[model samples]
Target chain A: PALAAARAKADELGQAAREVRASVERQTAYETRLAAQRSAAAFSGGEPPARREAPGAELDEARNAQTVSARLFEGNLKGVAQSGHAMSAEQKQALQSGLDDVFADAPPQARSAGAPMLYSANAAAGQGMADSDLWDMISDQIGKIKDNYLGVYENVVGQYTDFYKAFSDILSQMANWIKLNVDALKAALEKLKKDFSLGDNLDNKKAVLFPAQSKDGGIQGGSESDARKWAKEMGLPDAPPPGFSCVQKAADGNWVVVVDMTPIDTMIRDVGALGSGTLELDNAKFQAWQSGFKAQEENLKNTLQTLTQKYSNANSLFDNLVKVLSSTISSCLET
Target chain B: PALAAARAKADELGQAAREVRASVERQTAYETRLAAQRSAAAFSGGEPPARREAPGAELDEARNAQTVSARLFEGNLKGVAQSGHAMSAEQKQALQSGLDDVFADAPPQARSAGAPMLYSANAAAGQGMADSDLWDMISDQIGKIKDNYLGVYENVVGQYTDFYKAFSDILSQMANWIKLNVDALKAALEKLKKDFSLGDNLDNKKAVLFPAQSKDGGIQGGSESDARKWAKEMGLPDAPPPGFSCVQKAADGNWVVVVDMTPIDTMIRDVGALGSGTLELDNAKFQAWQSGFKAQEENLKNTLQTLTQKYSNANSLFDNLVKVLSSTISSCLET
Candidate 1:
């Protein structure tokens, strides 16, 4: 009786390992509820900062806004960028120096600090093409440059947008789909282990972690040269941090391949049946992963939808920025 | 008696040169006013289309607007371009092709036209190096690309704002200054010609035309090459019309130069004096410029102000466009 009483007090204090699990259980449940409260806080006030759009939605207003945004061509002042000669010094000067006079009368707020790096004030501080034939060349190739940069950014945005959709689509299904697969694999593995009656430690018998090699075949971060020999294969960043980045499988038997797992890290919040996909014998942990954190699917989705769409105000602002540049620069010059 | 009879008849008709002169005198005076009246038409009875500030003054609100314009570092989003392995193919593919799905719900514009130039949709049509080592190298330089483009555009706007200030300051004084110099020079020349009377025709000598050259010393316009050379210079169709543009000087060594005298080809209407400093000249034309054309100035200012500020709506839009790209891309990832 005394031991039982003492153990109850120990559980309350969480001083023992088994005792800690019970407290952790209560705390985790409490935090789960708290997360919802935080989400509610996002929309609690009068209005959310930027209204959220449905997931995977397009901003329909963007293009019309884009079209009407540029007035240089819309007005009697329809001067298009000259297709050749790149950008002239006169044009550049008018471009970089002309706007200064426009803002001289306004507040300091109009001046976007550090913006000159792209155009630069002069060589000493700017893009260092200060005396460059670069701008001269770029100016000369203004058509290509505008097209180039504009396309580049668009490319960046487009590619990334698709990435997000893939992430969202895959992630939304991950909770349910992962669990189903993990359960099937693990349930079979558990039965197989019992029927085989082999008392083998799975770590030694089924799967193992070999030292991850750098592209150079030497060590990376540790025993390896720390010098990078292999190209960094993109998966992603920050979620798992380094050293935890890659998972490898054979490449050619010889198929010696390495993969980055951070993309998966980003989508799942420490829960899911990823272990089921591991192509190994041990599968006990796989099903358990799906069991504990299924509820986060809803929380995670809400956070993502709220978070991602909430900042489009910025998206609109940057969109407006380039258009302003296109418009003003065009307007300042006679086409 | 015949002279007296002629004078009597002239007075009877009220058509004599002096009689016409008196009426002409009033008409000349009337032209002075009509110019002002004509100027008021744009701003006539109701409010002018645009408002004006002092010549050196500004739409101070532009910066305040600019200040409020961007939410770049704003909010939890604040995801900047990450420096890394330039965008991967999967990334590029995701970028260019993904939005197509988003827009399936909308109109034809799911695609941002010309945006692919940045990423170059296909290996062949893009900035070649199909498996470009370029972005790979740039991936290491992510900080530079985002920071650089951002800075360059800002610099472009700032310098031009200053240029406009230089424009306003120099131009505010231009009308009076040009007249002062020209009048003084003309008066001195007039006196000199009268004092040293010779059989010289002032009108015939003082103004004349010289061939506008194509910088290669070849005649521009008014030549068979007029079809090509003049056509080449403007590159415009139905816009500049024909013979509306040129470079000329007098035949004599007196060295007279005639400029377009208008900046409309640039964007502004011809009436405002861009002036000597781009800001230096005078004010008769300044106040008279304002009084006679103040309304137009207001209209022009309004047009300028309306257009300039309107483009901010644009700058904000472009800023937003890619941002939508950024934000969407971001939300897609498992941050």
Candidate 2:
């Protein structure tokens, strides 16, 4: 059972890593084409000159190659995960070889050197060449590393670092904001956890991360369900209902919860209608109410960021980790 | 003066050579990508699968590289042509080097050792690959030869042959078809040629290559003014007012005559109306019109094939010619 579970986890990680790689590959190609168009546009007095049909065909070819690589990686991940076995050295080497073949003709500027030491330099150069969009920056940096290193351990690590940093910032800010609306945030998190089937242990743990007052105004160990019930009783009726949902596993084996805010907004509207004229309040009361709402909004944002960041970071980390693991497997098999 | 004229001619040839090379480069890249996409499409159950976005960027890079090469070639061609001087060995060598760089990443399949000797073989393969589309077959065959032969000699020969056979067929077919209605066909060809000259002589030539003839009589030869006057006298109207117009010299130093057909058509219609169909009946009386038309169409198709064959043959001859010319020029410069 342990072996099976381990294999499954590895497979999942492998799939995630592939997705990350594919995403990077796509964005890189897009940025390169965008750069060319911009350059052409600039050369032709900026009127978005007649499109060069030649580049379009080439772009399509690159895309096809990337897609093939992505699928290959995905298959590799599934093999590892389902078998509950580490990748053989031969398997790793084969995968790496496949990656090299796919990127054999990548732009010189986009290729990376295989060492981690060169990643920052490559990344900076790539960033300089890319457009101002964050995604574009990330894509350029990743593309540069790929071109240099051809999916080496260092390249993956560098790319992951960039992705994780962005994801982490988003999560941290969101979490801090949610802390203000402790009661509402806790309720939403629990409902999300249950919906995503992120294991009961994870759900309970997340609930404990944000404590709220009980119905009697007594301090109690926080429970997501209890928090939701409390919010309902307080006429803060925008609470989520219980249901099964999907969740992505984090690097630490915790489930990151998610929820659709659309339904929640409907409930909030209902509550607003109920509280309409009856809540005549002074400035202090209004401010306090506003603060609660603000806290709740912030918390929600933090939770979303944290969930998404976990996925992004895990994806990046897995890409590098796979490289290491594959190398290890290859060496072992050779011996 | 002789030296200057020689130099200018050399420059013009060199520039023309570069343009051809650039076009070849673009075409090669385009075909390579097209091949890849085709393979992918086949693999993905014939439904056009979503492509990876990375190649788009790579294509842009390829195009930029091509663009730079093209501009350099064009500049070189104009400079040499205007100066009326032969290219120095170094200049030719540099131009060759530039072409090499442009085609640095040509696919292995395109650069087979058997390529030059196997023009017919490659053409056969290309025909199959292009699914029997004549243009594709021709394009593919030229591209194959271009990939194999590094210098301009083989390419020039190949292109000349292709163009000659194609052009000859077009001319012969028009001549035969317009035998009875020669006046009308002449008017049409003149009108069409005018439309062909939208600034670029290269484009104009390409446009003229398309097989087109009016139901009325037309002839390929004679001075421009004579042809126009003949058409006007035949009751063809809307002919351009007699004057010197946009005419460009071909590689062989022949002039290309341009005439707008719409105005000529207006005149032809008026003549037909005024003649009460007598001119039309007279034209029909010359031969079994449908039979002559069919025979002409068959002749045109055969001519096209012959033209393509000629290009193939010329490619081989030009390869030898360019080699001798380049070596001779090099020896002269060295002495």
Candidate 3:
């Protein structure tokens, strides 16, 4: 029992240390995110981005609740540890003797000072205490003691569970949003590639016809008419005044489609604009955004790990308390 | 333009550094998980637990593929950077003159040595080169140039997309599984609390009836019968021959149910067994499991961040290449 007790203390201390380390990690990540957000805000040089508003409020609420719960539990744990250390074996045994006297049906012992007297059959009869009264008093005391620990156990369990669910929801929401954005981007890129028609031959010419030529019957030949129909069905058309097309008469007497240079030219100009736009980030605001989000997520993750350990500890402590009560009551009844 | 170019280069370097940092984080997490797993394995005196087997295979495969893709892109980026650094402005200008000669209708410039000679209208006509031949040559060259860069862009985009999807799926799957487990545990705890009946009184007597007591009408009187009926329906019975109950005649002559001591006794004994069984962890295997799982998840998250950056770079580089091609073609056509 002593070795087991020693090990339990060590484990408790270790768990506490782990919790502390995880808390530090979370704190560092939180600071990183804060700095990043500040950097991003400074770069805008105006009102802060609305994107920062209302973001992480739900997460913050949950985090605060869980953090408080953990700290409260830590305080309780420390109290218990300190009380155990302060009480000597002789003092604990003296208290145990008083408790034994209360559970016995005999006269008071010298160590039973201040203990309840109703347990003694003779003394209670003389005091006019009824059997129902005895039952009520014992029942009430048991209820109170059980509730004290049970409440602690229940609170820890419920709070940790709530935090876990909240964190899970956050992760799911973010991941789903990312998936949605990525899917959209992928679709857009595919369409862009198709419209550009960089890899095809005249035999399978995916012609892109201009609206001006097709609209005014400028498409003269039978082959040209066919090409215009294909382009129209494919939803490929240029704006007014006519831009360009790859449709030409082949030696085989059919109009052949080639790579349309229009989309390529547009893409090139757009690329230059894009390079000067999004990727430019002259103030490195984009970097800040990335770093901030990454750190914030890391903070959430670390807190989750800490909470999980705390939850486990809550269960263990509750179970231990229950066992002690069970053994004490069983022994009393047996005697 | 020069400032923009410099900023773009700096951004590229910053992104590479971020990737490297994330890579280091992932490496550290991986090592932590490895050590934890080894510690867990060493604790179980027999053969290693099968829980370690076949775990993370899917994740490992995706990680390997994505890592290789990122490295390849990094290599390509480095090559581009080195080539740009190695070639001087004069050398690049000379190469540009040769390219211009090919795009011109007529040219015999000093820098046009070794350049394609078919662009000159007079020279091609003299050489019996038909218009069709000229068109085919230029088209083939354009296709080749586009394909070279397009292939690189496409591969990076596709690989990164696949990795993102894979990692997302993994996250979703793990999150879902955790929810399922936590929900089940929560439900179990709730049921245990209910069955234990530590919080309720006779007014809402959630009584646990022993089967042996109600079997032979051991419960007497109308109130007792009512109690027996309630217990029968409630499905709270103990094993034979009989245990105990809290049913007693109140002052009003109605049976009042109180907290049953039987469940409490049973719970206390069970708690002792549980503490000795699971949480004892004489070898600290449970700690190993928790640490290993935590580190493994961290590794996954870090790798995901790296891949996200790589995906962004892929898009940026592709856009830049497209712009270069677009400007060259537009200038050639205008001339």
**Candidate 1 residue lDDT tens string, B1-335:** 12222223222222211222232233223333333343343224222211122211121212222222222222112222222324444555654454334333331111222233234334422345442343233222222322222222222222223222222322222222232323222222232222212113211211112122211011112333323232222222212444443223222222211222122222222233333211333555545544543443333233223323322332332343334344334433423
Candidate 2 regions with alpha-carbon error over 4 angstroms: A1-259, A262-267, A270-281, A329-335, B1-335
What number of clashing residue pairs does each candidate have, in the order they appear? 81, 58, 3
Per-candidate alpha-carbon RMSD to the true structure: 38.9, 29.6, 40.5
What TM-score does each prediction get for chain A alone? 0.31, 0.28, 0.28
Ranking by TM-score: 1, 2, 3
For model 2, residues A1-105, the per-residue Cα lDDT tens digits are 232333333344455446544544444344334434433343233343111122212112222343344444434433333333333444444444534443345
What local distance difference test score does each model get? 0.28, 0.33, 0.33
TM-score of candidate 2 restricted to chain B?
Answer: 0.23
Candidate 2 local lDDT, B167-244, one digit each (tens): 222232232222233433333333333333323322233222211111111112334443333233212233234733
Which tens-of-lDDT digit does each residue in B83-185 have in candidate 3? 2133233333433454444344421221122134224223343344443344334334333322332222223223322333322222222222220222212
CAPRI level of candidate 3 = incorrect
Residue pairs in steric clash, candidate 3? B209-B236, B209-B237, B210-B238
